[PDB]
């Protein structure tokens with residue numbers, strides 16, 4: 001058993017936003033993992049609300065910090081045959097994509113996905129007397145239709161032993177960071193604030209075989225039936241209605257199941273979005289009272305897939 005780990009990230013205030021006359025209202029205390037929100041429409045005597053998380057990251061926080069401190073251990077577990085999930089929840093414009101992919105490709109500015117690639121293949125090539133098979137899949141849920149970004153409309157099936165899976169989901173084998181970076185490139189080329197993006201990395205490992213799955217999820221902006229389903233599942237967990245959306249059926253394991261999960265609550269510092277921030281913080285605050293039970297995974301001799 002283990003708690004869902006929630007962390008907060010806040011992007012900088014923009015010139016554009018200050019030009020419009022918007023005050024900053026989000027403050028963080030990085031030592032204490034805390035977020036504080038001023039209500040710009042607050043009565044005299046009212047105290048800001050403070051939320052506490054496992055870690056917080058503010059405007060001056062760098063991409064490597066967030067990776068090495070919060071996410072790197074999740075990916076080391078995946079390398080040892082655990083299932084892991086990272087997902088970014090937040091208002092459009094607050095940095096879900098910046099966090100997950102990066103907007104820039106340079107090593108210092110990459111997001112969690114391209115760093116996970118670096119991490120994974122460095123480990124592999126440091127490894128000895130051990131064969132790893134890495135496969136990557138890249139899909140999108142839009143209007144509760146699963147689309148395959150690397151092909152199409154795909155269907156969801158729930159078999160007894162194996163579990164919940166997707167029919168005909170393409171899944172490319174990747175020897176390199178170069179090769180797995182090409183897959184993500186072609187996926188992005190096929191693709192945004194209304195859709196959910198899921199990047200899946202599997203690592204079969206033989207020394208005698210383990211398998212770890214990693215879901216790297218960039219959700220639709222919290223402003224959409226799937227965000228509502230996720231809203232209700234979290235609330236029940238913290239009868240869970242997983243079947244109310246394609247998204248919550250897929251993340252079934254990451255939310256009260258067989259996986260290590262990290263939520264990245266992404267926030268904007270500005271006064272025009274007090275209510276959207278509040279909603280995110282409250283949601284991130286429920287999420288941290290969710291308990292998963294991650295196990296290490298066996299893998300059959302026969303894992304032949306196309």
Ligand SMILES: Nc1ncnc2c1ncn2[C@@H]1O[C@H](COP(=O)(O)OP(=O)(O)O)[C@@H](O)[C@H]1O
Pocket residue numbers: 010011012059090091092093094095096097098099103193221266
């Ligand atoms: N921490 C950050 N530091 C610098 N720029 C950021 C940060 N977070 C977001 N941005 C930038 O602000 C914009 C919004 O980020 P994005 O990830 O696209 O938001 P979302 O995907 O949640 O809609 C992008 O241009 C992005 O490059």
Ligand SMILES: [Mg+2]
Pocket residue numbers: 096097192193
């Ligand atoms: Mg985005």
